[PDB]
């Protein structure tokens, strides 16, 4: 029972750390979404002198 409980507690704490790392990852993900948008903006900007 001690093994069952400590496994359970480790997985619970892991789930907490998991959703934490998930939020950090998605934060950087949407940050990169802005980055891809910025590269698109750059491609837009060269056209402004081009056509």
């Amino acid at each position: 029972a001690s093994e069952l409980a400590a496994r359970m507690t480790a997985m619970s704490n892991a789930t907490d750390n998991a959703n934490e790392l998930k939020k950090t990852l998605s934060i950087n993900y949407n940050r990169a979404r802005q980055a891809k948008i910025t590269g698109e903006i750059l491609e837009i900007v060269a056209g402004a002198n081009a056509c």
């Binding site: 590269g39 491609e43 060269a46 081009a50 056509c51």
Partner: protein, 479 residues
């Protein structure tokens, strides 16, 4: 008589001043004759990009402009470039201009074919898809060809896409008795010289038996200009129409680097002042590769089986090159840089190379059912592998871990040796027939050699040879 004055020189972009009425048509051949660095009159072959206007026109060069003072006279011949075609090429390493790269005898230029010729009719195509075998184990396992169709390789960097193509070239080229047609474009003179050497060694360049040669070479390597890198695919297509339209044979069309082939006019559109498209993209490059692929068609005359190959750009699949290429190719092969990271050579993208002829209607429900089970286990293996690297192989259930064994195994036994590979690999290559590995994968998902190792499955030819390697490694484990 329509002489051009070389109006402005901006890279391969050339403003030309042909005369007012005598400004030529689109895709016009022109030749800026002038003093070379030799001082001899080098005539610069060039293509009419577009009418700038006012008797001046935008034109991509095929030669190098280094030495073009402005106003220089240019023979606007007017029409699409007529490649020396047919068996004249078969044996000749032609330039993109069709000039002999091979230091060969000059081609029979009576054979001559206009470059940007259009594409065929849906009526005019031959209409049955056929498994062109490979000698390549997991290739023929995972996906059958539509012979006469488009063999496509979305390629990693230095991928052995070269190597995969090369062993495939060896196998299918000895098999298919059509005149092979290798286009080495945007490529390495080391790699291309190896290709020419191994085509003579493959008897198909046939350095003695030139024009008994069952192959041609089109040369468009990356040292050529981007306008040179632009045009050469159509030149390959014109030779392709001469052998599959005109000579009407079941054509063999090695074609690469298609991503560099994109990349050139992709680079040249802003040189043309055609507006910025995507991340390197030219705008109507969609339509450009569409004319490429549509021109690459098995006519009713001949089956234009077409080894096409683009660099999958930095393994970005949504990158507009492979994005456009996805509808283009008939059977397609991403490789797996994971399997190259697994070290496989062939490193087939196991979930990610599909075929038109991948069907129980087509491959047989033997083959399709086998691959159904196979890719099923492979996919759930990739799935549960995440809970592996988080949760350890201890976390595995019974059939999951059996599948995991099956995964690492069928990975390894899916890897075969190419006799091409034998310097970068060093192994004897086995031209692996298809139903042999159908038996082996039936056995692998049957767990027969589950006794054996994936070390004993790593880069081998037969499931019997796999059990033999198991015998070898077992007796070595005795030692």
């Amino acid at each position: 008589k329509n002489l051009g004055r070389i109006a402005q020189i901006i890279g391969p972009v050339l403003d030309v001043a042909f005369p007012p009425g005598k400004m030529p048509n689109i895709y016009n051949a022109l030749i800026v004759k002038g003093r070379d660095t030799a001082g001899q009159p080098m005539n610069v072959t060039c293509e009419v990009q577009q009418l700038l206007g006012n008797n001046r026109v935008r034109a991509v060069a095929m030669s190098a402009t280094d030495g073009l003072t402005r106003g220089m006279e240019v023979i606007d011949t007017g029409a699409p470039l007529s490649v020396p075609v047919g068996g004249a090429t078969l044996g000749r390493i032609f330039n993109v201009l069709g000039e002999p790269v091979d230091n060969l005898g000059p081609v029979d230029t009576r054979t001559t074919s206009p470059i940007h010729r259009s594409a065929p009719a849906f009526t005019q195509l031959d209409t049955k898809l056929s498994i062109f075998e490979t000698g390549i184990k997991v290739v023929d396992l995972l996906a059958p060809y539509r012979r006469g169709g488009k063999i496509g390789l979305f390629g990693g960097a230095g991928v052995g896409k070269t190597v995969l193509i090369m062993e495939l070239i060896n196998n299918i080229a000895k098999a298919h008795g059509g005149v092979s047609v290798f286009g080495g474009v945007g490529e390495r003179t080391r790699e291309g010289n190896d290709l020419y050497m191994e085509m003579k060694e493959s008897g198909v360049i046939n350095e003695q038996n030139i024009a008994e040669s069952k192959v041609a070479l089109v040369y468009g390597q990356m040292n050529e200009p981007p306008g040179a890198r632009m045009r050469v695919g159509l030149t390959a297509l014109t030779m392709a129409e001469y052998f599959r339209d005109v000579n009407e044979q079941d054509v063999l069309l090695f074609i690469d680097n298609i991503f560099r082939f994109v990349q050139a006019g992709s680079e040249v559109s802003a040189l043309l002042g055609r507006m910025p498209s995507a991340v390197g993209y030219q705008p109507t490059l969609s339509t450009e590769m569409g004319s490429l692929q549509e021109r690459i068609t098995s006519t009713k005359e001949g089956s234009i089986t077409s080894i096409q190959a683009v660099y999958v750009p930095a393994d970005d699949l949504t990158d507009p090159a492979p994005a456009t290429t996805f509808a283009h190719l008939d059977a397609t092969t991403v490789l797996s840089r994971g399997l190259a990271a697994k070290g496989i050579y062939p490193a087939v993208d196991p979930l990610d190379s599909t075929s038109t002829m991948l069907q129980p209607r087509i491959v047989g429900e033997e083959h399709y059912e086998i691959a159904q089970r196979v890719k099923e286990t492979l996919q759930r293996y990739k799935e549960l592998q995440d809970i592996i690297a988080i949760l350890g192989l201890d976390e595995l259930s019974e059939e999951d871990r059996l599948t995991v064994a099956r995964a690492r195994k069928i990975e390894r036994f899916l890897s075969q040796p190419f006799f091409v590979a034998e310097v970068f690999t060093g192994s004897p290559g086995k031209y692996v027939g298809l139903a042999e590995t159908i038996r082996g994968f039936q056995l692998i998902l049957s767990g027969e050699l589950d006794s054996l190792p994936e070390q004993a499955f790593y880069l081998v030819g037969n499931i019997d040879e796999a059990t033999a390697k198991a015998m070898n490694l077992e007796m070595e484990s005795k030692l």
